[PDB]
Amino acid sequence: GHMPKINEDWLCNKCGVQNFKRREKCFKCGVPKSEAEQKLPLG
Numbered sequence: 001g002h003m004p005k006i007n008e009d010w011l012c013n014k015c016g017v018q019n020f021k022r023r024e025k026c027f028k029c030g031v032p033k034s035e036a037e038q039k040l041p042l043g
């Protein structure tokens, strides 16, 4: 079926955490995912 693959995690640039893969911001540091690991061309 579908596969957005937005739930693909993102390693933070400050706290460096493995998050809930769907987080817009880190659970403790609160850095934006847009300011972290970029994904495949798909909004």
Ligand SMILES: [Zn+2]
Pocket: 012, 013, 014, 015, 016, 017, 026, 028, 029, 030, 031
């Ligand atoms: Zn963070």
